[PDB]
């Protein structure tokens, strides 16, 4: 049994049939040790007496909030959550396994530049009694730098039968001295609590690997007098990190085989939808969304 928040404890137990429960002793957050009594959830029934309450925890029926009383009015409480270890592995019921990259990819990440700001997002079919918490850091070093906001709702992409719900979070690394290269992976830790069930997820990554740039800025044309050679030029996205020379980009110019990749910020094609993506010059990160234009 360990402590999550103050007055919130998690106990872990394995699901092999002939396995025991845990004998936990609940102490009351009080000075006086006289006539107090215990209760569970919303029931009024006394479980026992004493500043201390020894119990066994074997099932979700033993979880929930134990409250000690005295003189009718409430004294303090102890919530208990269960972390379920099925057989070596821990439970992963609440977050869906979007087996896109490798497998067991429960929480995903993207960054629109090399600033340190990134956004993570997980998926879940559950829609009630949910409570998350995100923490992060690069390496065992500086516990600070990386700070995270609050997980929020973001989508509702309904699917056959059960409806899907997407949650996202925003994070910001802030190194007292920025490095020219990442030697250790950024690490994300999500605590997921669904009713009485506790679980925690983790993902490690390099920013250099989870980069998606905003689409190319603004495009133009130039057929000139009467010759029909559609000339296309754009500009580096506003969010992209600067100096654009130290942080080169690359592009893919498409249309409606014939695909043309290029580095420079301008090119010309042949006339007949038009569009152009953008990718980190150095690494095979993610292509940006498309930017269309008339034929």
């Amino acid at each position: 049994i360990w402590e999550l928040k103050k007055d919130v404890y998690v106990v872990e137990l394995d699901w092999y049939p002939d396995a025991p429960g845990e004998m936990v002793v609940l102490t009351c957050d009080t000075p006086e040790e006289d006539g107090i009594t215990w209760t569970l959830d919303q029931s009024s029934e006394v479980l026992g007496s004493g500043k201390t309450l020894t119990i066994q925890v074997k099932e979700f029926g033993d979880a929930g909030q134990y409250t000690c009383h005295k003189g009718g009015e409430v004294l303090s409480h102890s919530l208990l959550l269960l972390h379920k270890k099925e057989d070596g592995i821990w439970s992963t019921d609440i977050l869906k396994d979007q087996k896109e990259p490798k497998n067991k990819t429960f929480l995903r990440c993207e960054a629109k530049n090399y600033s340190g700001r990134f956004t993570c997002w997980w998926l879940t079919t559950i829609s009630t009694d949910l409570t998350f918490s995100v923490k992060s850091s690069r390496g065992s070093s500086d516990p600070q730098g990386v700070t995270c906001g609050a997980a929020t709702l973001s989508a509702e992409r309904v699917r056959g039968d059960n409806k899907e719900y997407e949650y996202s979070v925003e994070c910001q690394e802030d190194s007292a001295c920025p490095a020219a290269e990442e030697s250790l992976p950024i690490e994300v830790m999500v605590d997921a609590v669904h009713k009485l069930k506790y679980e925690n997820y983790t993902s490690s990554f390099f920013i250099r690997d989870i980069i998606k740039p905003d689409p190319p800025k603004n495009l133009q044309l130039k057929p000139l007098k009467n010759s029909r050679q559609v000339e296309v030029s754009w500009e580096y996205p506003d969010t992209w990190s600067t100096p654009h020379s130290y942080f080169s980009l690359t592009f893919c110019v498409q249309v409606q085989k014939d695909r043309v990749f290029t580095d420079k910020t301008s090119a010309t094609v042949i006339c007949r939808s038009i569009s152009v993506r953008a990718q980190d010059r150095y690494y095979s990160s993610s292509w940006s969304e498309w930017a269309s234009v008339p034929c």
Partner: antibody
Amino acid sequence: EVQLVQSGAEVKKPGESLKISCKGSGYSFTTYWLGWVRQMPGKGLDWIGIMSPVDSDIRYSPSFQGQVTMSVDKSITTAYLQWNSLKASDTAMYYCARRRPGQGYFDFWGQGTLVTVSS
Amino acid sequence: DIQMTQSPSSLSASVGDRVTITCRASQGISSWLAWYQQKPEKAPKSLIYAASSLQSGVPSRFSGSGSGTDFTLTISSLQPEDFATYYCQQYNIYPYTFGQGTKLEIKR
């Protein structure tokens, strides 16, 4: 005023199915787990298993696993024990009981349901 | 399963006596033992849990002790309503199992 009130004595022939109930009241129904126990003619108590009122989290004694079926319609606060094919050996008294939380034993007991299986 | 073994299978005592049933487990069950009392056609009443703790409601005259493997039950000063058979139960490892009972017949 905790009360587990079970359905009346039943009598059946081997191979018939049967579902017995136990309505609870006087207590917060969704806080306490419910369990069943058998007691054969002049014998001791067989722990059949245990289960939750809210979610379908059941715990059958390996001996009764797949022999019987536990359920609970929380809207009417009633637990159910069920057979699909009764044997003579099944005839006994069937108690339903309430599992005291943070311990695991039985807080309170039903008054029993006499079940007779004979040809 | 964990074998619960009560003894004596039966005994006889008078009103006002100090009596003690014992119970023992085939394994270790910590202090996770409960005691029940049953009468002829009646259902069982829940008396003691956690080996030594009285369920809210039961008389002072009852009590239990023991931990791990050998547990008991004692009535300091016996009384009429206390005549019945008594069962112990292990609630440590599934399945929870009972003793075969201990009848208390009157001594006459």
